[PDB]
Symmetry: D3
Amino acid sequence: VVNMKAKEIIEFIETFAPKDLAIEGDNIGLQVGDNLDKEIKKLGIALDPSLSVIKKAEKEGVDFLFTHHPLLKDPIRNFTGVIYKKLKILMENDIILYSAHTNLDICKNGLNDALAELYNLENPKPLYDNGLGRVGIFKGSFEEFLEITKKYIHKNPIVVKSKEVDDNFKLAVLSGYGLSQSSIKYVAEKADVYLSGDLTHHSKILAEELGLVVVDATHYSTEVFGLKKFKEFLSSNLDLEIISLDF
Amino acid sequence: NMKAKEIIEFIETFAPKDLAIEGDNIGLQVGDNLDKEIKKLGIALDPSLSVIKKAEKEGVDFLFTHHPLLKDPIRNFTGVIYKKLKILMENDIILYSAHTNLDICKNGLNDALAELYNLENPKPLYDNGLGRVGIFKGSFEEFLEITKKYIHKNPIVVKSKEVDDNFKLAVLSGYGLSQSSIKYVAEKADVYLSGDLTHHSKILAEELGLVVVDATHYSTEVFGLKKFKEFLSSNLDLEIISLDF
Amino acid sequence: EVVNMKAKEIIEFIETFAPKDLAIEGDNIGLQVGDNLDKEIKKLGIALDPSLSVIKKAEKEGVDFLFTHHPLLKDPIRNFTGVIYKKLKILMENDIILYSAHTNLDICKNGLNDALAELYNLENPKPLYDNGLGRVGIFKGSFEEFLEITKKYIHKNPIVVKSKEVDDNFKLAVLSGYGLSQSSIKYVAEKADVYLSGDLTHHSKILAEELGLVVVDATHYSTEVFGLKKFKEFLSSNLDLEIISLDF
Amino acid sequence: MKAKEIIEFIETFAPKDLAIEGDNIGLQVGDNLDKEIKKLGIALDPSLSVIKKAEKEGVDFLFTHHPLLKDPIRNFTGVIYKKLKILMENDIILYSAHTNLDICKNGLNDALAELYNLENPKPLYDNGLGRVGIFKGSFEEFLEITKKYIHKNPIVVKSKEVDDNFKLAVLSGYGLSQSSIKYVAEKADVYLSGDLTHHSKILAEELGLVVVDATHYSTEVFGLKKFKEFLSSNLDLEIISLDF
Amino acid sequence: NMKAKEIIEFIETFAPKDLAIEGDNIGLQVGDNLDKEIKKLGIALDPSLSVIKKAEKEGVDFLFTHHPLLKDPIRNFTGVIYKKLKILMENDIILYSAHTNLDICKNGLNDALAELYNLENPKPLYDNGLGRVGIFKGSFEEFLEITKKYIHKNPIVVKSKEVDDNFKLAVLSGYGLSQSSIKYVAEKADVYLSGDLTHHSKILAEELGLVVVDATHYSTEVFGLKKFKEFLSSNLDLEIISLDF
Amino acid sequence: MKAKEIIEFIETFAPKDLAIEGDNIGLQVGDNLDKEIKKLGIALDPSLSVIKKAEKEGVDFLFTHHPLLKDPIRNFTGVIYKKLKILMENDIILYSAHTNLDICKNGLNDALAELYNLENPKPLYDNGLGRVGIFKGSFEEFLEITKKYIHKNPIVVKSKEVDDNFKLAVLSGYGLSQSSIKYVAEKADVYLSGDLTHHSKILAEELGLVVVDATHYSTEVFGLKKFKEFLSSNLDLEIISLDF
Ligand SMILES: [Fe+2]
Ligand SMILES: [Fe+2]
Ligand SMILES: [Fe+2]
Ligand SMILES: [Fe+2]
Ligand SMILES: [Fe+2]
Ligand SMILES: [Fe+2]
Ligand SMILES: [Fe+2]
Ligand SMILES: [Fe+2]
Ligand SMILES: [Fe+2]
Ligand SMILES: [Fe+2]
Ligand SMILES: [Fe+2]
Ligand SMILES: [Fe+2]
């Protein structure tokens, strides 16, 4: 166990998930920070750079805060309320905030590959062109798929049973939010079952009409699974204390 | 009997089309002759394929839905939209929608929720006219039981903070739980009741200390829709059924 | 010798002649109205326009596959009333498939523009635009031998904007349908002496006069129907299938 | 009289605020508006031949209905070079009243409305274009008036039979776009305008709207002649027409 | 013994935020609690790094700047903006801005210039209400003498034409010498007083025969800012200093 | 020589494809390019007085660095009227090589780079504007070269102390925008350009970038004079300068 500098953590992460992989206009990289020669005693991993995560980072003496989601998607020019409180804590404690978003989704053994491997997808391919998600054939019954889901991801997934599903069906997976109306239409042409998160009403109705079976294992869980794999990957390779904050 | 235009004038008297949010696809969805004579009106939340199939089966002549058939325009007619239009057209079933104009109007879907909780001194939540906000004269757990009894028995409760009696309560029928809505409503109420909660919105409400209650998109509208159906039945000499509720 | 075909077989044959990739950007080609393409087809109807009367005539003649050059809609819609209601009703209750080959039929080999280029026997023909619309080449003859061919085979009374005297062996551009927009006039003025197309309007006439471009309006309809008949003769020769024309 | 005084007279008759948004009305080409004007020319189009003819007739003030340019430019070659050259070396002022002349009272559309003696006339569009009203007569008395005063051989799209005392809409110039056909079909039995094209013809047939194309040129020149005679009556000034 | 609400309310009384040009980033720039108690107010033209550093050294808790901290929004916090927010946040210094609303308001930055030259019948130069234009009751050389004495000792003068006495003078505090501004003002005045002249604007002014006087962006605003500072000091029981002037 | 031959020579030296964006380069005003040329005039700006001077000196081919118009127009009044009238009545060709003259080799930026003899010079931006390199010397010999050859009273924003053998970036014309300051601050210690404004000054101070404003005019005229000497050396043609 040893102290690392900020650059060295960043180059290691960017080796695993190159910034080249992020879809256009994704706010990846350094979120908050100035000096990358800052010395790091404690790396914190989180899904969200939420207020309570940042408070907890300060309480636990985190020096480098890694989050999957960027601090801001839409840019701002006034600093009040919640964003004031978050930046104040990060700045007063001089805590570095860094994010790997879609580049962590897409890269090999990333969040989507983690799901694809979990379901042991036969000859998996990118679901989208950019290329988010994985699609392939699940060599098993629908109910062995659900049991794997319940065991490793979320024990109470929402199932939109739009049609009967035969063994050896085509399965698409997308970590996080993949259940938009436009996504449903697209995936309906490519798979029998769609595993993702953040189901809403209109998407549910749409999936039923198209006969696409949708499984909502929550936005949180479908990502945290991969994040745990990512956290174990860092711990094995870096001589550095690493904790998780919101999982 | 009664003609289709006569059904439309009644609805548009209650919920004028001008009340609708800009570019909301309200009004006649599918139909040609409005002097068509109507013996059986059907009410639905969604103009879904199964709703439309069920309408044909039940001999519905006028299909009223809260949601429009299409939000985004199209120029090809294949797959699901082909089947839906084929059924409606071959049977000459009129499809008509009152969307946000039904949300906003007096005694509409939001007012229905506002009355249920008996909100003291109610006001529109947004300026365009969506949602209601007011004081709930009671404890948080009397609010929750009313929710469980009349709306949805298993609402997701994001308990961002302790809630004292006589708190500010905002209600929005349908989809009111976007990130933009959370930020806006956090400044106007202590508790926000709506539908279609997603992760980022949940996190955001927690940061802002807004208590959010997701009683589902479906249920928070169907409540008002049932009231609307009873209103139509009281005033129109016409067989009226509900299709997806 | 006369036989029923499935819709997909007809579509694949047409797309062999006029591949869908040949169509210019955002052109609404392909399946307009229909669902099941294993539908069996006894009667193919060809039309220029998917007009209300064309569709009525298709239903009256028991057409099962309706091919039109123009798409049903250029601009998308989200309400279905009036005329579009009547057209979709007829097509759907009768399960008539509506399918379109638009600019891909204009551009392809032996397509609508090639038909014109071939008619006028254009020496060393080239595409008029880069996307692939129109043909331009040398007309090996006088201007009035050009006019007589036009009057005999395309339209008996074409509008001629005589912007200048035209010498023999002139450059002739052809564009089936609507090629007489102001931007088109300016562009073609740099590439040809005479421009044969359809749908002339006032400002375009004035503009052609200023540039000295001779414009011949043989109508939108006729400059396309000529090629469409060739296309219909092509289908009739290759498919054992009853094929009629509806608006020509 | 000076150019500004002529301009002020025209803008009294057709105020510039009446023009639909982004219509390129007003001074097209010119510098000194205190210049004194000895010969005014009226034209439909500021075409090359119109401008050449203006210089030949010694016109110093050229009024056109259509603006010189709709689309702005930043290079000066070819035809636009020649037109600006002729106007500038001879100090000929080019001025346009476009849709404001269409919309204004006794303007181009009103001229048509008065010609057909439309009973209880109203503007066809909300912005101010076109007139619609009832024609107190048969369809063929409408045609006879058209053939006598506007165009001897108008294209008639007879989409349906027309009863006496029908609703007649008029729009001088180009009113036969697809969007216009759809809109006017809800307001009239017969539509008189110009510049018919194929798809618009088909659309009118489907909707049962009877369309009469008396050409873009003729439906405007009629009003322009009225406008020219109006100027001649009020201004002590030599006034000629150039393309009509 | 004054809190932030009261200072902000006072400023917005003088220069209402509604007077600001559309999408002008006025108001609270950096801050959270406005019940914070304020004993030392700092006034600055620019919220620059050195201004903010100087604010910390002088123990300023409320920092007022004419220019907003950011015009273009950002979503990353590194480099210079990191340093600035860090200083403001750990010291809990409130940053608040009155920009174009201070330019336009009565007795604001533009009116300050108009009074200085004693413009007869002054009127707003633009429709949004930036700048003042009126007649200068004097010669051009009395105008320059007032300029050199009170604004800037050596202003750039683009003498595009001779200027007669009792000429029309337009003034705009800050940056008013854009090419479009030159075209517009050329039609309304003989002489244009502003700041931040660039080449193309100089050339354009010469062609149009508009005499332009560049008394710098800095000086034409600081003049009004000094009036504003003295106004605050007269009305507020509070230590008030200037930072970059 | 014919006009096309001159254009062809210039475009050999500064190819039009080198220009950034839809930069309004090339033929500004003119029609016949088989015109034979009696006097070529070179100017920085196609200003009214430059054009007046061109007509006075009997220039028939007017070359300017800046285009006549950046934004397109559809009305021809006031100043643009006066400029076009003079050019058209005298049949004077107006032609511009703008950013293609900035970017090309031995162009305006290379001229500055050579003046300061930048060791190992490179393009400042990716499109190819400006040059950056090492100035083998102290800051005050950089200033002494600036005051003697470019402008006697340059504005110096001394954001920090400058060591010998520092990185110097040059951009002829307007390179002192806020976005440019931010970009260059990461690539150089000293930035030599023109058209400094307040916000850019403040920004340079925060970033520690030393900015030297030797005016928009002078930083380009330096290169333009070299370009004029090049044309004079290669073309048998009377060549004068108009605004420098
Ligand atoms: Fe996510
Ligand atoms: Fe993700
Ligand atoms: Fe809804
Ligand atoms: Fe709703
Ligand atoms: Fe066509
Ligand atoms: Fe075509
Ligand atoms: Fe017209
Ligand atoms: Fe007109
Ligand atoms: Fe300013
Ligand atoms: Fe200002
Ligand atoms: Fe330059
Ligand atoms: Fe320049």
